[PDB]
Amino acid sequence: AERPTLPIPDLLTTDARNRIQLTIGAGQSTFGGKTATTWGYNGNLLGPAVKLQRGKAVTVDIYNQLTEETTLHWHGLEVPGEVDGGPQGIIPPGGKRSVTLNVDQPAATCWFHPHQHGKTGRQVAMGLAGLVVIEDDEILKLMLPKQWGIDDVPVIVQDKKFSADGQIDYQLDVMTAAVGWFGDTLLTNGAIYPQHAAPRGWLRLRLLNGCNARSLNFATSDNRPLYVIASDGGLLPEPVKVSELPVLMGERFEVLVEVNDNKPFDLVTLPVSQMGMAIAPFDKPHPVMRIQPIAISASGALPDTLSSLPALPSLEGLTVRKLQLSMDPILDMMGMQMLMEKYGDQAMAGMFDFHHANKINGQAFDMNKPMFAAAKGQYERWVISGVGDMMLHPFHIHGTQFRILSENGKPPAAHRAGWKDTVKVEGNVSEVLVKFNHDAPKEHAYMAHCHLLEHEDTGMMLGFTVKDP
């Protein structure tokens, strides 16, 4: 009858021993009345919100209760490579690995997910993702909405496709290696079109695009504005009012939205210009969740000023690193053909071993050979080109929060000008200003890769190390 309520990830903080336990395991979820095998952190699906504090360290004990290897990448955390959880962070099935997270970065919503070599897309599709809520001394002074699960709410948005038996229907084949794995069912914290009761006043949504390959574009059903207050790596200097908010795979934004009177409204996602992603029902605005106003306590506010953003340093004398993304023309031809044959023209609306056909600087990912050594504690200019390549590539660099200088041909939109760990590359060139505060040796290198997961799984990744020059 009624919509399910929005599931709220548990806020998970350290214990008296300053430890946090994460169990990775297989269970069961229900989607549209049909049960499915799913994977989760501390549960059947998705995961908790690990809560960290700047200036404090926590030890996370990770128990892998799957029957296959996995890793745990702390997406957005400025931590050394040894705990970064790239493909070299193997956790054996039935085994346990512990990492120390010594947090030293501004308040932010980050997240965590597998980075198993060649299998990251499958493991995310099966259910593995969690959140990270970093707080500091600055953000709690602001009196933003702060009641977790009431007026401060995480919103993890993901698509899946299921086979007739109800099971998740994941495949890494020549089509998905080209355009990505995408589905026809939209999930919001694991539920289909849930409702969230929100007190009158301001509602804070921590948005995460957790799709393998689908880009999203958030808006409200009645075109009330969203006020962006934070990006991947934390607060903007001041709120940025937008009518729609595109969000790439793996990106987070925090928005405030007004909840007035008592009329419900929807958070929705608007059709995107991305290949494969405008097939019905995604050819039209698609609801994400229903917001239901209520009359309980809430004192959160939208501040005029949020934080201070340092100036972009001088580009003069900085090391420039060039990263050329590419796809084997045969993969582009064959994958495109299969997409068009199956879905037809709508797959372009609004516009052979494939396992190593996606590449950076002419090379599919080689775990034994980091491509370069970056300087610790020094700004570098990284130039990432998708010239000659049709596809969307949200490009993620581990171990940093960087500043976008140029995004795919233009300066970043204001709400994208702050701290980011992902930058858009699509048929043009992006430039980012990056600094690495922590070491990563050859045996636990940082990754830089496309976050369209099927591209990463088929080669579009490089490792790099960081050491004091």
DSSP string, 147-159: -BTTTEEEEEEEE
H helix count then E strand count, the chain: 4, 31
Give the CA dihedral 360, 363, 368, 374, nearest 10 degrees.
Answer: -40
Using omega within 30 degrees of 0 as the cis cutoff, is the peptide bond preceding 281 cis?
yes
325 close to 300: Cβ distance less than 8 angstroms: no
Provide the pairing of β-strand 195-199 with 245-247. Answer: unpaired
Closest to 401 measured CA to CA, from 307, 324, 294: 307
Indicate the DSSP class of residue 318: P
Q: Is 398 annotated as a binding residue?
A: yes
Q: Is 444 annotated as a binding residue?
A: no
Q: Is 286 annotated as a binding residue?
A: no
Beta-ladder partners of 290: 195, 266
Say whether 141 sits in a helix, a strand or coil.
Answer: helix
Domains 1-146 and 317-469 share a fold: yes
Chain centroid offset of residue 358 CA: 20
Both tokens of 171, joined, read 């495949």
Q: Is 196 annotated as a binding residue?
A: no
Indicate the DSSP class of residue 177: H
Q: Where are the alpha helices (DSSP H) in 238-298?
A: none
- The experimental resolution of this structure, in angstroms, equals 1.8
Q: Is 415 annotated as a binding residue?
A: no
| Residue listed under structure tokens 């990744």 | 461
Both tokens of 259, joined, read 């909840």
Give the CA dihedral 37, 119, 111, 43, nearest 10 degrees.
Answer: 20
Class of domain 147-298: mainly beta
Q: Is 73 annotated as a binding residue?
A: yes
By what method was this entry solved?
X-ray
| Residue listed under structure tokens 């099966």 | 126
Amino acid at position 452, single letter: L
Q: What is the topology classification, in CATH, of domain 317-469?
A: Immunoglobulin-like (2.60.40)
Say whether 144 sits in a helix, a strand or coil.
Answer: coil
b/e 183-216 (16+ beta carbons within 10 angstroms → b): beebbbbbbebbbbebbbbbbbbbbbbbbbbbbb
Amino acid at position 183, single letter: G
Amino acid at position 371, single letter: M
Both tokens of 218, joined, read 């958030």
Residue range 1-146 in CATH 2.60.40.1180 = no
Both tokens of 399, joined, read 């171990």
Q: Is 211 annotated as a binding residue?
A: no
Report the distance separating Cα 113 and Cα 45, nearest Å: 12
Domain boundaries, the chain: 1-146, 147-298, 317-469
Report the distance separating Cα 353 and Cα 359, nearest Å: 13
Cα angle at 332 between 70 and 160, to 5 degrees? 45
Q: Where are the alpha helices (DSSP H) in 271-420?
A: 329-343
Q: Is 117 annotated as a binding residue?
A: no
Q: Is 110 annotated as a binding residue?
A: no
